[PDB]
Every structure is written in C-alpha cells, then in structure tokens.
Design a protein around this nucleic acid. Structure first.
Lengths: 37, 51, 140, 549, 83
RNA sequence: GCCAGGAGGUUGGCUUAGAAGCAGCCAUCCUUUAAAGAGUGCGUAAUAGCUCACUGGUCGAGUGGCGCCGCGCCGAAAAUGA
C-alpha cells in the first residue's frame, strides 16, 4: 500500500489529517500505510 | 488418614505444622454429607464436629 | 494446591470424557466429571439422553457440586413438528407443520428458561424462533 | 545471565509433574557466585577461584544462613514421606542423622518420586565433587533395579538373576569401528561371568562368537583386563556378526534372548539420487556400512519408480548422514524430494469402440468390441460386466479381453498411471469362427479402453493421508493453522496426556517432511505419525501446470 | 540500571554500558534497574527525553523485551512467523 | 471524552471436521428493557474473549452529514548551466 495514488480511508482507524503536503494514511498494522508518491 | 485420601495436601503439606496440631474441622449432614462423618468421627478418628 | 472455583459447562449425555471444556476448565478441581455424567445421565431419563447445561464447583478437598438446567427448544420445536435433521433454510423450505397448541405446550414446558416468567410472553419468543429453522406454523 | 533455582523448580512441574525436592543452594546468582551452601550435612561449602585449586569450608557469612533452614526443613519434611523414623524424629524433638536420611533420600531416589537438586557451573570447576558424592550415595545400584527380561528358548519371558555365579547371559549395545582393534562392540553382560579367550553364543543371530580380547574404555587409555562380571559394563573386542541390540549367552548357558525391543520410527521421508549409476553401488555400500551402527532409520527404494527412499527421524540426522556419505564413501549425493503415485480416472460415463481386424488372406485376426466403461467413487474397485447377449463374442475370448483392458490401464493416456475405481463393464462385440484369435480381442479390450479414457475425461488422483499429531494446546491451535494451510483438511482432536491429538486429511505432495515443520508450529513439543486412506482429484489447477514435458 | 551520582548507567539489550546524562531543565531518578523514574520540570523537554530513552532501546521485538511508557506489547510469533 | 447498564432463547437454520453476530447461503427475530443487534471491527483452531452500536450519568454550547464553487494541492522521473 505504501506509495500509491489512492490515499483513501482504508482500515477505519486510518486517517488523513494532511501533513507535509502529501497525504499519508495513518493506521495500526502498518501494512496499511498508503502514501502520495 | 484424611490427608492422603481427601485433603490433597498429600501428607507433609497438611502436617508440617503438626507440632501443635494445625488441623481441626469437617462438615456433615445425612446420607448426602454424613458418610464422611461415620468416617471422620468414626474411623480411629476424633474430629467430632456436630454430628 | 487449589481453592474454591465455581466453573460451569455445556455437555450432552453421550460424551463422557475429560475432554475440553471438561478437563482444563475443571482441572483446577479434581472435578469428578464421571460422577457428573452418571448422576445426570439417569436424571434426565425422561428420554434417556438429551443435551443439558451444568455447573460444577470445586471445594479444595476434591469436592464437586453440579447444578443443571433443561434441554433446548431448538429441539423442542423440531421434536414438536417431525423435522428430521432439521429444515434446510428458514424462510425457504417446509417439512412438518406446527399448530397453536403444539407451540403453546412447547412454550409451557420450558417456563423458567427462555427469558421471561410469563406464559403469555415467552410463547411469543417461541412463535418466532420456529420460523428461523425452516418450518411453518398453523395460525387461526 | 538468567541463572536461577526457582524457575527450574517451577517448569519442572509445569511440564511433567515430577516433584523436585532439592539438596543445595547458591551463593549469589549470575557470576555473583563464590561458593555453595548445602542442606544435606548442612556445611558451608565454598571454593574460591574458578579453577578450584582453592576449595574451602569457611563460616556462613549470614545472608542466606537462615534461608537454608526453611528448605532444610522442607528437605527433612519429605524424608517423612519415606523413612517413617525421621517422620516422628522431625515431628517430635530430636534430629535426623547423617545416615538413615541417606536411605530415605535414596529410597526416593530409586522409587523415582523426588529429585535431589544439585546444579552448578563446572565451567569454573564448581559443583563437581558434590554431585559426585550425591551420585555414590543415592544413584540406583545395579542391585535394586527390577531385573531385565529375556524369553527362554520355548516362548516365555524369563528374568535375569544378576549373580556373577550363575548362567552367563549378556547384553550388548554400542558399535564403533576402531582402526586399532576394529569393530568395537560395547556390551553389558547380565548374569554369570564373562571370561577372556573363551566363546559366546549370540542367541539373536544364532551365531557362536569368539572373544578375541576383553575391553573397557577409560578416560585416557584402553582398559584391557580379563573378566567382566554379571551386569558389569564395557566392550568386547573382535566379534563380527554382532551389532546393536542383542543377547549373547555362555557357550553352554541356558541360552535365552533378552527383550530390549524398541520402536522410534523415521518421520521425515527424504529422497536421494546421486547423479550417475557409478554411485548406486557405492550407495549400497553406504546403507550397508550404516544400519549395523545406525539401526534407526529406513531405506526403501520407491516401490514404483527409482529414488532410494532415505527416511529418518530428523533432518539433522539425515544431513550428518548425507554429509558423511559425500565424504567417507564419496557419494556425490543430490538429495531431492519423493515423487508421488497418481491415478488416471474419468468423469463421464463414456462408451467407445475398440475394433481390430486385418484381412490379407488367412490369419489376420478379428476383434471388434464396444463396452460400457463407467466410473466409481475414488475408493471403490476395478470391475467388468459380462453384458454378452447371445454369445456373439464366444465367451472364450472374454478372458484376454479383460487383461488387454488391464494392461492398457497400467499406463494411462495422460501421464501413464494405474487407472483405478473405474467400473468398466462391457456389452456388444463380434467374432469370426477362425480369425478371432485370443490376442486379437486382447487388443480389442485394450484399444477400446484406450479410446474410452482418451475421450472420457481422465482426471488425476493423489494420496490423501492421515496425520495424527500430539501437542500441548497452544501449538495445537497454531498447528490447526499449519495443517489447514497445507491444502487438504484435517479432522479432529482429543486430550491425550498433556497433549491434544490431531486427526487429519493431508495430501502427501503438500506434506513433504512435516517433522521439522511440525517442530516449528509445535516448537519441538509436538509429535505425530502420518498414514493413508484414499486417492482424490486435485482441485483442477494442477492438471494444467503438470502438463510437463 | 544504576544511576551513579549524576550519570544514568545501563546495560540492557546491548553489549556495552550506556551513559545517559542530565540536560538543563529536567532531572533523572533511578529507583532500580527495571523501572527508572524521571523528575523532569518541563513537559516539552521531558517527553523528548522520554521517547529518546525509549528510542535508545526500542522494545516490542514481536513479543517483549524493551522499555515502555505504560506501553503494552503487540503480539506476533516467536520461532514461528516464518513460512 | 469521562463512570457505568452494554441481556435470553441461540449453538439461528443451513452448511462444515466444527462455524457460536464473526467462512459464508437463505437471513429478514420476539420477550425481559430507561437501552442491548441474528450484529461493527478486533480475537479463535471453531467458542470463549475484546468491542462498538443504542441508554442513562457528567458537562455546558453549539454540531455532524449531505449537494455546490474559486484558488489551490497530490498525481508529476531524462539526459552540456540555470
């Protein structure tokens, strides 16, 4: 999931409180860490 | 007798404090809880409860 | 050693062995679980077998005390309708009808169980559950 | 680091249930160690430097002085469970002596119900002579050990009376190869007296053997004496046929065979195939020079194709073998994984034609047959159904017509494997009073079958096994994991001892050596077996990949 | 752990000893090896040090072993987790 | 957010080696209730467990959700110095 243009809201803990100007998707089990790159 | 059969304190476990006899007690009824009162109170024993 | 630990089980009169949750749930006990199957086997001898809830307590000196309850109405609706293995799917197939009395007697027999202690209430809980196992009811 | 006492005492009974009961205590944990207190004689033992050229018995520096007492009591306490003299003489007023306690404790130490806890770091010459003392004073003399057993030459088990003045009966054990003397055959006797320059009769192999010389092995040299008495232990020099697990007797002795029958099976089934054919012979030499020293594993050349099956109780085991192999004998062995036995089988009730006939005048043979060849569930049996109407095919051509089938079923139309559980049948054919030979209709049945399978959609069968695993609950769970994550599905479970069985279906292909894989989801504490039941269709995707050239 | 005089010393899951030492504004306080305490008078500069000792020895390791705030382990497999 | 109430029949029937709200197919509840589901995720080998849902307790003023526009922003790596 890391670095892919779909930074939705995957596992319902994952958040988009936009930082650095490139949305990350922040969760728990970090096989769920999508990124904007 | 009543330490290696019932009271699972094998023997040394239930009578390590036997220097001053640290064991006195037993429950009893009729037919249901009495059969161990014709044993606890009658089997070369003397923990005379109520019955 | 071990002290007082009241643990209950869910066992039918047919599997009499120290197998989970028979053993380790009552291992800290010395639970006479073969004197539980026996004192309860012939106890529910209104049919011979039946599946029944239980509750066995340890008191240190190898003391076991079990308290029991009745079988289910997921067997007193299927034994109340002539459905063999059951009735493949609820809101689908049909096998053997039930009526306004059969359901009433069923609701009766098991009074303190179900949920309420009002004959004109638990009977409703029965009036539903019959449908969820694949069988019709005769109304009027 | 991590040194203890307590924890050992805990996990001992948290895994087995055998009460320890103990004889000595540390002076400081990890490297905080100087000397050792004991609770036997109650003497403050202590060394000094690690090498232990400076031992001592200096006073108790306090600290644990009192603590010895409690467990000392406990020590003494358990002495009241055996020698019932120390019982009253500890629950009255007096003191238990330095002697009858040795017999209470040895009582417990031969009845197997207690476990005198001595420990220590002999890296640094500590804890040595103590455990030695305990060993002499407690360890089971070959006297009270309940006698071994050895069936008379009649068919009834007999006891060995370990008097060094009776019938000479002897067991053997460990088989080395010593470039000096040779086949070192490590033996422990039993009854009677073992002399030198005499003779022995190994009852097992029925061969009479010659004691070339006497042996025991010391720590620094060969102990060469003359006689080994009843139940004394050592080794005999010069003794051919004899291996491990035997029973020899005096040249004229009552002549019996000691029991000593054991059963640990080889779990993992490895395959080994070492290049050319120049190796196979040297491999014969290999498994030859094994078994006599290594009677623990099994060698069974795949009872269908090549590959000598090398099956052993552990991957390591198998690998020190695969290594000594490639070194001692040279065998450039390239270990692979076992093949499998697959079985052709159709799906749809297909009924085709198998003709023959050749007319060039004279004998050219006649043979037209059409048969039912219907299928059966993947466990039934080979069949045939005489559906002959008027005797069109003269019955006497039916025999070979069934084998032509049977031998055109040896190798199927696909991979070429024994077609099974395909209830054939028959029905309508033909003949000619002359041309119709036996082999002609043999070929009728044959070809008819071939067309029937080529067209009838033959799918591939594969062995489905019974894995039955022993395991303590936790591992059990994650092994349900492993098993169902090995293709086919499992079955059930039961609490056997401190364990939980695992009834299991398992296709051998995905199963290849589970022992080391077992010991990864059981982490060692698990056991199992593997067995068989029936054959089954692969879930499709393997019949498009296995179209191998 | 063993805070000698002014210096916090420790040899945890690492070879050599460690010397963690006081910065301006905040203060250490070792009760014993297994549960070190900190008198830090600067809520911002303190938590820095908190997560910095914790970063000195990152715990977890699938099961346990390490330093924890009030931290709770997150479970995974030992001699397993290796297909 | 904070303290807590967070049920019973049931193990829904199916199916499955077992499947309990948790593998899913048809599902398609009623009573005890001020509220508690044929159920949201975590957990399990299936349960147990964890937990949310709804309801009260505190608190004291605002609050989620849906359609729309303008500038943005990510998506956005190529070669002599900008």
């Amino acid at each position: 999931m890391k670095v892919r243009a779909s930074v939705k809201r995957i596992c319902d803990k994952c958040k988009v409180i936009r930082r650095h100007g490139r949305v990350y998707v922040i969760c728990e089990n970090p096989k769920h860490k999508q990124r904007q790159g | 007798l009543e330490v290696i059969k019932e009271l699972r304190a094998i023997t040394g476990l239930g009578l390590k404090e036997a220097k001053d006899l640290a064991e006195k007690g037993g429950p009893v009824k009729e037919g249901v809880s009495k059969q161990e009162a014709e044993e606890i109170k009658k089997k070369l024993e003397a923990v005379g409860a109520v019955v | 050693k071990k002290v007082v630990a009241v643990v209950k089980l869910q066992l039918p009169a047919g599997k009499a062995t120290p197998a989970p949750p028979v053993g380790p749930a009552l291992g800290q006990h010395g639970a006479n679980i073969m004197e539980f199957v026996k004192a309860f086997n012939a106890a529910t001898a209104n049919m011979g077998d039946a599946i029944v809830p239980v509750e066995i307590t340890i008191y240190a000196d190898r003391s076991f005390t079990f308290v029991t309850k009745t079988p289910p109405a997921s067997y007193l609706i299927r034994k109340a309708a002539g459905l063999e293995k059951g009735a493949h799917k609820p809101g689908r197939e049909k096998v053997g009808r039930i009526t306004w009395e059969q359901v009433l007697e069923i609701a009766k027999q098991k009074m303190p169980d179900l949920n309420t202690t009002d004959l004109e209430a638990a009977a409703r809980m029965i009036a539903g559950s019959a449908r969820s196992m694949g069988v019709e009811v005769v109304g009027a | 680091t991590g040194a203890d006492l307590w924890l050992v005492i805990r996990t001992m009974q948290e895994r087995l249930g055998a009460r320890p009961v103990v004889m000595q205590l540390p002076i400081g944990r990890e490297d905080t160690f100087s000397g050792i207190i004991d609770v036997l004689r109650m003497k403050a033992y202590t060394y000094g430097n690690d090498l232990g050229t400076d031992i001592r018995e200096i006073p108790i520096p306090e600290e644990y002085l009192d603590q010895a007492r409690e467990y000392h009591e406990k020590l003494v306490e358990v002495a009241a469970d055996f020698d019932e003299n120390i019982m009253l003489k500890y629950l009255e007023g007096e003191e238990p002596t330095e002697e009858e306690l040795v017999a209470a404790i040895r009582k417990g130490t031969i009845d197997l119900k207690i476990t005198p806890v001595f420990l220590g770091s002999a890296l640094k010459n500590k804890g040595v002579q103590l455990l030695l003392d305990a060993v002499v004073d407690y360890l089971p003399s070959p006297l009270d050990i309940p006698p071994i057993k050895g069936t008379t030459p009649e068919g009834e088990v007999v006891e060995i009376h370990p008097d060094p003045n009776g019938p000479l009966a002897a067991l053997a054990f460990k088989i080395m190869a010593d470039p000096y003397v040779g086949r070192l055959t490590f033996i422990r006797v039993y009854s009677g007296t073992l002399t030198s320059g005499s003779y022995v009769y190994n009852t097992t192999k029925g061969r009479k053997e010659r004691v070339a010389r006497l042996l025991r092995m010391h720590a620094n040299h060969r102990e060469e004496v003359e006689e080994l008495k009843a139940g004394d232990l050592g080794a005999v020099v010069g003794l051919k046929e004899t291996i491990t697990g035997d029973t020899l007797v005096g040249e004229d002795a009552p002549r019996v065979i000691l029991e000593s029958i054991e059963v640990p099976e080889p779990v993992i089934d490895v395959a080994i195939e070492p290049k050319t054919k120049a190796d196979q012979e040297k491999l014969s030499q290999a498994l030859a020079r094994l078994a006599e020293e290594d009677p623990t594993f099994r060698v069974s050349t795949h009872p269908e194709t090549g590959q000598t099956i090398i099956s052993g109780m552990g991957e390591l085991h198998l690998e020190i073998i695969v290594d000594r192999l490639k070194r001692e004998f040279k065998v450039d062995a390239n270990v692979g994984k076992p093949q499998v036995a697959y079985r052709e089988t159709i799906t749809k009730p297909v009924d085709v034609e198998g003709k023959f006939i050749r007319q060039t005048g004279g004998r050219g043979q006649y043979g037209h047959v059409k048969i039912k060849v219907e299928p059966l569930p993947r466990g039934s049996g080979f069949e045939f159904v005489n559906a002959i109407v008027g005797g069109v095919i003269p019955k006497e051509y039916i025999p070979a017509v069934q084998k032509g089938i049977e031998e055109a079923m040896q190798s199927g139309p696909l991979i070429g494997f024994p077609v099974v559980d395909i209830k054939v049948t028959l029905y309508d054919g033909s003949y000619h009073e002359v041309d119709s030979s036996e082999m002609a209709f043999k070929i009728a049945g044959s070809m008819a079958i071939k067309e029937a399978v080529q067209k009838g959609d033959p799918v591939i069968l594969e062995p489905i096994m019974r894995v039955e695993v022993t395991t303590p609950e936790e591992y059990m769970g994650d092994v349900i994991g492993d098993l169902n994550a090995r293709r086919g599905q499992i079955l059930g479970m039961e609490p056997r001892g401190n364990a939980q069985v695992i009834r299991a279906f398992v296709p051998l292909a995905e199963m290849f050596g589970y022992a080391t894989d077992l010991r990864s989801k059981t982490q060692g504490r698990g056991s199992f077996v593997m067995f068989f039941d029936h054959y089954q269709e692969v879930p499709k995707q393997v019949q498009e990949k296995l179209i191998k050239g | 752990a063993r805070l000698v005089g002014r210096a916090l010393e420790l040899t945890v899951g690492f070879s050599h000893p460690v010397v963690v030492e006081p910065p301006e504004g905040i203060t250490f306080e070792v009760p014993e090896p297994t549960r070190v305490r900190v008198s830090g008078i600067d809520k911002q500069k303190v938590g820095q040090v908190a997560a910095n000792i914790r970063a000195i020895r990152k715990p977890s390791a699938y099961h346990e072993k390490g330093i924890y705030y009030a931290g709770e382990p997150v479970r995974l497999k030992p001699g397993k987790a290796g297909a």
